Amino acid sequence: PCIEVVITYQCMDQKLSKVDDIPSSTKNIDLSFNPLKILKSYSFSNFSELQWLDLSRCEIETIEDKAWHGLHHLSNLILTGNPIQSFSPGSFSGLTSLENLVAVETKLASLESFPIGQLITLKKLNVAHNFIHSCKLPAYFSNLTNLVHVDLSYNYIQTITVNDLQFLRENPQVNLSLDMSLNPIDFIQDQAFQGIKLHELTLRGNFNSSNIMKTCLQNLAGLHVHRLILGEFKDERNLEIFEPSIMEGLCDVTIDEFRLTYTNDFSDDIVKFHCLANVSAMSLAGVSIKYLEDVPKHFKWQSLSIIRCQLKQFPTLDLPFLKSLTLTMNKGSISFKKVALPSLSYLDLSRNALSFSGCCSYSDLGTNSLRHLDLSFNGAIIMSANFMGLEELQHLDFQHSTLKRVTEFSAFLSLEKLLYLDISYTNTKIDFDGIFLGLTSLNTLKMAGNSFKDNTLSNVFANTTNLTFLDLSKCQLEQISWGVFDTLHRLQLLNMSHNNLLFLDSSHYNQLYSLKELALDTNQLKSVPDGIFDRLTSLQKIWLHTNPWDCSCPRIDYLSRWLNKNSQKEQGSAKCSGSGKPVRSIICP
Amino acid sequence: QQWFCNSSDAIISYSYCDHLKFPISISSEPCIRLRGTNGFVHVEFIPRGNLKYLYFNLFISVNSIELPKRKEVLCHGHDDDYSFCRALKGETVNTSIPFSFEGILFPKGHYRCVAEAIAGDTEEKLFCLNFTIIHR
Numbered sequence: 065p066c067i068e069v070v071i072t073y074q075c076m077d078q079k080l081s082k083v084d085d086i087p088s089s090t091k092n093i094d095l096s097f098n099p100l101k102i103l104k105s106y107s108f109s110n111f112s113e114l115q116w117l118d119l120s121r122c123e124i125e126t127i128e129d130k131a132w133h134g135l136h137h138l139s140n141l142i143l144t145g146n147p148i149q150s151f152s153p154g155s156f157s158g159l160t161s162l163e164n165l166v167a168v169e170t171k172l173a174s175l176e177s178f179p180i181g182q183l184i185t186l187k188k189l190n191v192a193h194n195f196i197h198s199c200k201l202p203a204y205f206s207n208l209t210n211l212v213h214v215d216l217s218y219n220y221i222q223t224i225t226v227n228d229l230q231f232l233r234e235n236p237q238v239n240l241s242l243d244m245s246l247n248p249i250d251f252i253q254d255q256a257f258q259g260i261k262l263h264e265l266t267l268r269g270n271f272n273s274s275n276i277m278k279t280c281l282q283n284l285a286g287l288h289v290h291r292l293i294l295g296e297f298k299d300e301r302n303l304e305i306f307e308p309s310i311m312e313g314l315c316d317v318t319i320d321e322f323r324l325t326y327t328n329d330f331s332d333d334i335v336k337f338h339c340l341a342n343v344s345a346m347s348l349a350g351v352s353i354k355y356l357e358d359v360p361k362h363f364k365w366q367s368l369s370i371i372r373c374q375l376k377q378f379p380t381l382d383l384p385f386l387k388s389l390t391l392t393m394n395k396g397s398i399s400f401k402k403v404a405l406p407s408l409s410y411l412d413l414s415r416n417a418l419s420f421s422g423c424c425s426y427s428d429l430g431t432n433s434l435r436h437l438d439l440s441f442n443g444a445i446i447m448s449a450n451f452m453g454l455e456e457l458q459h460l461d462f463q464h465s466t467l468k469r470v471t472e473f474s475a476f477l478s479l480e481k482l483l484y485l486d487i488s489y490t491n492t493k494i495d496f497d498g499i500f501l502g503l504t505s506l507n508t509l510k511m512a513g514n515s516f517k518d519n520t521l522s523n524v525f526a527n528t529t530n531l532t533f534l535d536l537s538k539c540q541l542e543q544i545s546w547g548v549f550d551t552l553h554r555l556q557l558l559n560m561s562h563n564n565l566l567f568l569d570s571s572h573y574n575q576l577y578s579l580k581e582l583a584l585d586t587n588q589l590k591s592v593p594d595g596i597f598d599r600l601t602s603l604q605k606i607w608l609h610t611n612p613w614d615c616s617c618p619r620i621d622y623l624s625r626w627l628n629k630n631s632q633k634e635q636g637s638a639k640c641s642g643s644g645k646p647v648r649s650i651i652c653p
Numbered sequence: 654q655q656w657f658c659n660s661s662d663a664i665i666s667y668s669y670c671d672h673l674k675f676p677i678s679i680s681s682e683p684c685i686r687l688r689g690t691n692g693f694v695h696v697e698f699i700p701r702g703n704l705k706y707l708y709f710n711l712f713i714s715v716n717s718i719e720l721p722k723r724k725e726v727l728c729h730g731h732d733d734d735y736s737f738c739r740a741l742k743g744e745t746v747n748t749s750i751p752f753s754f755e756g757i758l759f760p761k762g763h764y765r766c767v768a769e770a771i772a773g774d775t776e777e778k779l780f781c782l783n784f785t786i787i788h789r
């Protein structure tokens with residue numbers, strides 16, 4: 065009657081009237097979009113180890129008592145969209161070890177009469193889109209010692225008083241995050257947040273007028289937030305104007321991480337407002353910021369994150385304690401401009417359609433401790449230096465960016481400590497054997513989607529001894545020069561699939577003593593030299609499918625016998641051309 | 654042959670190419686230090702052609718590994734930066750060119766660089782030098 069997925073059964077939208085063709089061992093049951101109407105008792109007694117129960121949109125109007133008997137392992141219960149409204153006492157009897165309760169849109173009216181006081185294991189409580197009018201954190205929250213997140217979004221909370229937050233003032237050891245979004249808050253009582261500590265406080269889409277917001281943020285005074293999230297939504301009520309003075313109240317709040325989301329009105333001054341000077345992590349997302357200049361040098365930001373914004377110019381940054389810079393998914397296109405960030409160790413400038421002319425050396429960044437450079441998914445990156453000043457670099461990513469002039473010198477000569485390089489799909493045509501000189505520590509080389517001069521794999525890996533991962537797929541390779549793999553004694557994965565190889569040579573694989581995975585599928589091979597795989601003493605997986613193998617005897621004898629004895633290693637099925645017969649099945653006379 | 658100098662970290666010399674021996678005197682003040690150098694190139698010769706469209710073909714090998722052929726334009730033919738772009742065929746050229754480079758890591762060993770000067774209007778070779786750099 066249902067749909068067996070795995071242990072996992074999917075009974076969604078099956079017009080069912082009640083939950084019995086399911087094994088007792090089942091650990092996940094999705095029963096949503098069924099007109100169940102009543103949850104009768106004893107019902108789930110035969111599901112001893114059920115973990116995930118989804119009862120969304122089941123038209124349930126009544127939860128009987130002990131209706132959840134036998135569920136001594138259920139950790140996730142989801143009752144979204146059920147008009148049950150009145151939860152009887154003992155409504156959640158039996159639900160031990162449950163840690164995630166989703167009661168969205170259940171016509172719930174208050175937390176004080178929510179019979180969850182005995183779910184000691186509970187960690188997350190989502191009661192969004194209900195009728196809750198009060199912000200009161202109820203008394204029984206003291207038994208819920210594992211509760212760390214409460215979602216009160218999309219309710220009717222208008223006021224925050226000192227007695228609403230009484231539970232946290234009494235218990236400063238409690239680690240709690242509150243989601244207040246889409247609540248029409250217009251008044252916070254004086255001192256209501258004094259002596260109050262929260263991990264994450266989300267206040268998105270609450271305010272319609274500038275002055276009600278300024279008044280309410282003033283009465284945040286005394287709050288300690290690890291992360292404060294402010295903003296609005298495009299499809300909701302917005303501030304007609306957003307003056308930086310609206311955030312005056314934040315000077316009495318101690319904030320570790322500040323996060324600004326979309327605001328209909330925005331000025332670049334908002335991000336440089338002085339109450340943000342001592343924030344340690346600053347973050348913008350969906351913000352219509354156009355320029356980021358003149359950030360006061362005494363700002364103590366250690367990380368800065370700019371996602372899906374609208375920067376017209378690459379920011380000029382002098383923040384002397386900034387350790388991590390992220391600028392990603394920027395709208396339009398920008399050209400890189402030099403920076404001077406002497407504490408910078410993490411730089412992510414990916415997915416910006418960014419152009420970089422002068423990559424790369426110390427003078428571009430002003431740091432000696434950069435370890436992570438992500439320039440992937442960008443525009444043209446014109447190489448002109450070989451990373452002098454940047455020798456601590458361990459992770460370098462150019463994926464899907466147009467590298468230029470990288471094959472015209474040893475552009476990575478200083479990167480003696482580099483472990484991860486990705487030049488895949490960078491439109492590079494390699495015609496210089498010394499392109500990878502200096503990369504003596506490299507473990508991972510991903511260079512898929514490129515090409516080689518004369519479609520020939522040249523001796524470019526002579527001094528990358530510590531390679532363990534080498535992806536050469538989709539490089540249009542037609543042949544391989546002698547000795548190219550002689551040094552790769554530690555290589556564990558070699559992907560040469562999706563090329564145009566017509567022949568192999570035994571000598572290329574005679575010294576891959578550490579090789580575990582070898583991908584030769586989707587080429588043009590019709591045979592292999594006898595004994596080509598005989599020294600791959602570490603081989604675990606090999607791909608040979610989508611090749612036009614010639615199964616005439618005695619030509620295919622070695623391969624057919626090798627594929628049969630090592631049938632556990634082959635992934636996919638190498639097939640004979642013409643007949644489609646698997647090669648492992650051929651027995652030569 | 655033609656000229657040699659050794660700096661703190663480099664031995665630099667050149668000669669004319671085997672296929673082209675047109676004379677030209679090129680020197681360096683100071684001797685190029687590959688760690689980084691500021692100075693002047695002294696050029697003194699009578700060109701076999703007009704320099705209005707002077708460019709170079711550079712064929713570089715580093716530790717016997719061939720780099721792709723390069724082409725570098727000195728005189729574009731309109732409002733050029735150097736006075737010698739005005740020189741005609743047969744006219745004396747004596748000039749000092751300021752140069753400066755730093756911040757690049759040069760591999761140890763020896764390089765070869767043959768520089769071939771072309772007059773872009775005629776595509777005729779004006780001279781050809783065979784530099785030999787030793788980095789210690």
Ligand SMILES: CC(C)(C)OC(=O)[C@H](CCc1ccccc1)NC(=O)c1ccc(N)c(CCc2ccc(O)cc2)c1
Pocket residue numbers: 447448449469472473711713723724759764765766768784786
């Ligand atoms: C290592 C040796 C000393 C042998 O050779 C060089 O150092 C060469 C040759 C210099 C030279 C000329 C005439 C006579 C002698 C030497 N100089 C560069 O490769 C270079 C110069 C300035 C740049 N800004 C870039 C940027 C990368 C670039 C790469 C390819 C390209 O086509 C354009 C730029 C490179």
Ligand SMILES: CC(C)(C)OC(=O)[C@H](CCc1ccccc1)NC(=O)c1ccc(N)c(CCc2ccc(O)cc2)c1
Pocket residue numbers: 447448449450472473474498665685715752753754755757758759760786
């Ligand atoms: C611009 C002028 C002419 C003033 O000065 C230069 O040209 C100098 C060398 C001058 C010289 C001439 C003759 C003899 C000795 C030295 N060079 C560069 O500026 C340069 C810049 C970016 C690069 N990216 C490379 C790359 C080198 C390189 C090439 C291959 C390789 O495998 C490793 C490194 C060089």
Ligand SMILES: *[C@@H]1O[C@H](CO)[C@@H](O[C@@H]2O[C@H](CO)[C@@H](O)[C@H](O)[C@H]2NC(C)=O)[C@H](O)[C@H]1NC(C)=O
Pocket residue numbers: 212213239240241263264
């Ligand atoms: C307070 O609880 C929050 C969870 O709500 C903790 O924050 C998480 O921290 C872990 C790593 O420790 C991350 O993997 C999660 O993604 C974080 N979640 C959120 C929502 O930020 C926080 O560490 C706790 N504070 C303590 C233990 O002092």
Ligand SMILES: *[C@@H]1O[C@H](CO)[C@@H](O[C@@H]2O[C@H](CO)[C@@H](O)[C@H](O)[C@H]2NC(C)=O)[C@H](O)[C@H]1NC(C)=O
Pocket residue numbers: 512537538559560561562581583
């Ligand atoms: C070798 O490289 C190919 C292509 O570069 C990898 O192919 C992908 O395989 C996964 C799993 O089957 C698919 O979901 C992707 O769609 C494939 N990509 C393409 C472009 O076909 C293959 O996984 C690699 N083999 C390894 C790493 O062992």
Ligand SMILES: *[C@@H]1O[C@H](CO)[C@@H](O)[C@H](O)[C@H]1NC(C)=O
Pocket residue numbers: 181203204205206207
């Ligand atoms: C649960 O909390 C109530 C009031 O907060 C308390 O009276 C009761 O003893 C607690 N349950 C225990 C400790 O089992």
Ligand SMILES: *[C@@H]1O[C@H](CO)[C@@H](O)[C@H](O)[C@H]1NC(C)=O
Pocket residue numbers: 248272273301
């Ligand atoms: C937005 O503010 C206006 C008055 O400026 C008010 O009429 C309206 O109720 C507010 N929005 C909501 C969702 O209440």
Ligand SMILES: *[C@@H]1O[C@H](CO)[C@@H](O)[C@H](O)[C@H]1NC(C)=O
Pocket residue numbers: 315338339340341342
């Ligand atoms: C930030 O820290 C400094 C130094 O501790 C302090 O003087 C200042 O009042 C703090 N708050 C700001 C600048 O808003």
Ligand SMILES: *[C@@H]1O[C@H](CO)[C@@H](O)[C@H](O)[C@H]1NC(C)=O
Pocket residue numbers: 526527716
């Ligand atoms: C690789 O580096 C070693 C280190 O001694 C060197 O001997 C060898 O010549 C290099 N390979 C080349 C330049 O092809």
Ligand SMILES: *[C@@H]1O[C@H](CO)[C@@H](O)[C@H](O)[C@H]1NC(C)=O
Pocket residue numbers: 669670671672767783785
């Ligand atoms: C440059 O000189 C070397 C020997 O120093 C020689 O082998 C080479 O053929 C010469 N190249 C040209 C273009 O003259």
Ligand SMILES: *[C@@H]1O[C@H](CO)[C@@H](O)[C@H](O)[C@H]1NC(C)=O
Pocket residue numbers: 697747748
């Ligand atoms: C070339 O110019 C230099 C610099 O002024 C000068 O010392 C030298 O004598 C000149 N050579 C000739 C032949 O005029």
